[PDB]
Symmetry: C2
Subunit: 495 residues, 2 copies
């Protein structure tokens, strides 16, 4: 009915939660604790070894990117906050004592959107999903006696009907690995950071279950674009919506802000990087921009942003000057536009239902972002080198999956034996493969499986699910270099 | 009964195109935000992600960037605790900080983020290499007082000729200064002359960690021994630093307040991180570490600092993976005892820290806290930095930087006219090698050279000296600007060891 941010900035935790009535200061310190938790996480440093667009120190990695993004998100936050202050609406919306947490949650959400991304990015994603799709064929789930699923337990046997449904969800879910979903899993089950509910909400960018099949509801198309959470994170996400008063398939407000921030940074950075990596020159870039635009009315957005960037940078290095100004001008037009977009739609963004991005529009601003994106896609991401690396990464991840396949091939009893006894005599290979998986991952497997009723007819299905989930955890946790090196060492191509 | 007005220290003016007049709280906030945007998007910061911290680059092992980032958070924590400790004492308004909370914390955070910015490849050993090479060329020893017959300086213009006395002094300062390359001094130079970020005066003050001129000779004043420990600025940054002290009301050889905060932060992060890293890189195990700590400490009054911090970390860990738990708790406990102690230390000495004269660190003490930091440091120095691998890499880096210096030596060997000719004509016919070497130097560096030299009166007897100075300064700029990997690869390429 209203807008009360005290009911959205939830400073409680999942375990050992702070309790009762807290002062402004004590809430501030709670969210500070969240900051210290995240910044000192292994997952963040691991970001410094994952590649952004290219694989050259001045070229950005997911860390320095996430860091520039952090600053853009903070800028947007502050502008929203003080535009609400100028409208004398802070107290009205419950934000008068939550300024700190507001900005901080945005900054940290920015800092860790990339946290759950696999090696080689979208192509590691691809590789994983294609491999598993070849093994599980979620397409074939009415039952067929020619069901191409290679896994005994997950085939649809005619008769058993609830079990068939669980089989459906398991197949689809395992075949929809996604970076964001993996990030929720990572932040909850594998790292056990025990963040505030608000922070976790800040991560949850899409709201579609990975096990989802068919067309998504019309009114939620944008929010259910990609999978947001896995079948295993389900009860946790339910709990999360309960704690942040989110409707089914709805989103946490602050997310929009960070998402906006993301877009902005990445766009200009990519062009800059393309000029460091020599893919095209500055004047050439200015030309591709000027052409792709095309509608030059006197005093439009392109003139201000791009053409003024270009005009200044020609008289102290010209390339750096041009991109500095391009970033500045872009930010100075787009950040307040995003802010205003947020405020003008605050009721629906607060309900978590608003089916649009802040910078998705017929706006000139939106068109400017699309301009940048087009120029990059046409003349940067098509650079033969970028594509070589994409092909390579796909082979490396497909290959690691093939190497560890022996573990997914074991029977329930055999694998359980392997988990319990540690070193099994009649499975030398599978044993050593198993020990190569990370400790945290194996613990997560053990914990998940131990929570299941072992006499239930569902048990073998859930176990296969959590085993595949173990393998995907392990592979998607690697840095590009590590995944590559592991693939080459295991393939006996190097020592 | 001196004064404490932070409005007179948090200077939000700039060197060029400065904002002017009477600004509101909000407009000042935006000024310092601008500073943040300036620094975070600098090439120098990303270059930090490719320079090594203690070990070489695993992923979970820290680099100067992720370190500087963790440091950023510790510095912010200390800042906030000082600020709200002053708020609880009802002293913000009293000290002029009531409208400068944002800038305070922000200046600390960004100073933390870029202390490492001016560091050479291979760290202290790149530093070593540079200074040793140049010392072999300039022998600043022979220029103390009294000119000499046997003056081993290989550079014609900078030998002390008996008679010319002002020139001899300038010669002295040039030799010493070129032979005292330092990361912090290079950072001031980097932030002013090479990057031209045009930060607020307060921010630049935040960088200036030591206050000794690199050209300094002899014992440093007794009352300033800690602040003049290492060189803080180069002979070329001199007029800038003068201007800086004028804008931040600093006495000669004095320091900017907030610096102490960041310095404290630095120490803390690095200490625990290193031990953690040593356990990732397998140098020793956790239980072994606990043992080396417990031994280096001494007996217990089960309730002393070691008990709380380390022993509670170890126990809380033991109830279980174990490694990560132990180091998480170790960091938490250390921070929770040391950060407020640092904060308190800052507030209890605020008059002298504000005067910029306070001759101590916040965590340099007979304090138990201080002793705990020293404990960590000792354990690392004995059982981590002595790991044969770390030392291999130190030796290697020294060879690489010594070698790059030898490769570019032909440029320092040219005469004034010849090098000038090379700068102006670009491609000179009778110097194929030197020409190509020159073009390999970075554009920003060469521009800085040209600008510096153009500022000089060309008919002055000082001119050839200043030019040689700014030329050496050009070479040191170029070499210290490299990442470890780049310096290494360039050295190998240029040596024809690979393509
Ligand atoms: Mg991103
Ligand atoms: Mg440091």
């Amino acid at each position: 009915a209203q807008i009360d941010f005290r009911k959205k900035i939830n400073w409680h935790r999942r375990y050992r939660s702070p309790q009762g009535v807290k002062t402004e200061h004590e809430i501030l310190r709670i969210f500070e604790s969240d900051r210290g938790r995240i910044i000192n996480s292994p997952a963040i440093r691991r970001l410094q070894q994952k590649t952004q667009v290219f694989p050259n120190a001045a070229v950005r990695t997911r860390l320095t990117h996430s860091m520039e993004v952090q600053q853009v998100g903070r800028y947007i936050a502050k502008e929203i906050l003080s535009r609400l202050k100028e409208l004398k609406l802070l107290e009205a919306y419950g934000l008068d004592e939550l300024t700190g947490p507001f900005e901080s949650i945005v900054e940290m959400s920015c800092l860790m959107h990339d946290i759950g991304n696999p090696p080689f990015g979208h192509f590691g994603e691809a590789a994983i999903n294609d491999w598993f799709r070849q093994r599980l064929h979620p397409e074939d789930a009415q039952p067929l006696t020619d069901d191409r699923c290679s896994v005994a337990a997950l085939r649809l046997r005619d008769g058993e009907e609830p079990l068939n449904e669980l089989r459906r969800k398991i197949r689809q879910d395992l075949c929809h690995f996604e970076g964001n979903a993996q990030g929720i899993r990572l932040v909850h089950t594998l790292m056990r950071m025990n963040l505030t509910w608000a922070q976790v909400g800040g991560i949850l960018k899409y709201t579609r279950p990975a096990w989802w099949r068919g067309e998504t509801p019309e009114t939620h198309h944008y929010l259910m674009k990609k999978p947001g959470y896995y079948l295993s994170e389900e009860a946790y996400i339910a709990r999360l919506r309960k704690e942040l008063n989110l409707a089914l398939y709805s989103r946490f407000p602050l997310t929009w802000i960070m998402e906006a921030a993301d877009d902005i940074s990445y766009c200009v950075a990519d062009l800059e990087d393309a000029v460091e990596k020599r893919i095209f020159t500055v004047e050439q870039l200015y030309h591709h921009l000027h052409e792709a635009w095309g509608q030059h009315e006197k005093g439009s957005l392109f003139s201000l942003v791009v053409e003024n960037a270009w005009e200044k940078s020609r008289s102290r290095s010209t390339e750096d000057q041009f991109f500095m100004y391009l970033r500045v001008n872009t930010l100075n037009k787009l950040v307040p536009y995003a802010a205003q977009r947020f405020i003008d739609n605050l009721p629906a963004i607060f309900a978590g239902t608003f089916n649009h991005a802040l910078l998705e529009d017929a706006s000139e601003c939106s068109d400017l972002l699309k301009l940048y994106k087009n120029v990059a896609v046409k003349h940067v991401f098509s650079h033969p080198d970028v594509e070589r690396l994409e092909l390579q990464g796909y082979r490396v991840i497909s290959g690691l999956l093939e190497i560890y396949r022996p573990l997914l091939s074991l029977s329930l009893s055999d694998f359980t034996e392997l988990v319990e006894k540690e070193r099994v005599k009649r499975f030398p290979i599978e044993s050593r493969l198993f020990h190569k998986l990370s400790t945290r991952h194996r613990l997560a497997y053990v914990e998940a499986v131990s929570k299941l009723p072992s006499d239930s007819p569902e048990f073998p299905l859930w176990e296969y699910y959590y085993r595949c989930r173990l393998l995907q955890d392990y592979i998607s946790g690697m840095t590009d270099l590590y995944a590559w090196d592991e693939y080459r060492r295991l393939m006996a191509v190097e020592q």
